[PDB]
Amino acid sequence: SWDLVTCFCMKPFAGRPMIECNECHTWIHLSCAKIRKSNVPEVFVCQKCRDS
Amino acid sequence: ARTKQT
Ligand SMILES: [Zn+2]
Ligand SMILES: [Zn+2]
Fold first, then answer.
1. CB contact, 8 Å: A42 with chain B?
2. β-bridge partners, A28
3. Beta carbons of B1 and A19 less than 8 Å apart
4. What is the domain extent for residue A7?
5. Which of A9, A25, A35, A49 is the most buried (most CB within 10 A)?
6. For residue A50, what is the domain's CATH number?
7. How far does the CA of residue A18 sit from the closest CA of chain B (Å)?
8. Which residues lie closer than 8 Å to A35 by C-beta, 6 or more apart?
């Protein structure tokens, strides 16, 4: 759990808020994605997916 | 979105 690395920042979950990309199904940290806890989008597509 | 720890 705690040490599982999935985000493109190559750093682990570590209990941090995360959001799953709807296109590549990768868990990304909210901070890395530039998303606030108070304003989570209903559909999330990560930057890697957006860059083609 | 499918989130955790939010
Ligand atoms: Zn990250
Ligand atoms: Zn993606």
1. yes
2. A19
3. yes
4. 1-52
5. A35
6. 3.30.40.10
7. 5
8. A19, A41, A44
List the determination method.
Answer: X-ray
Separation between Cα atoms, residue B6 and residue A49, nearest integer Å = 22
Distance between CA atoms of residues A22 and A24, nearest Å: 6
Q: A15 vs B5: CB contact, 8 Å cut-off?
A: yes
In the block, residue with structure tokens 């985000």: A7
Q: Does A39 touch chain B (CB under 8 A)?
A: no
Q: Is A7 left (phi over 0), alpha (psi -120 to 50) or beta?
A: beta
Q: How many domains does chain A have?
A: 1
Q: What's this structure's resolution in Å?
A: 1.7
Contacts of A23 (CB under 8 A, 6+ apart): A45, A46, A49
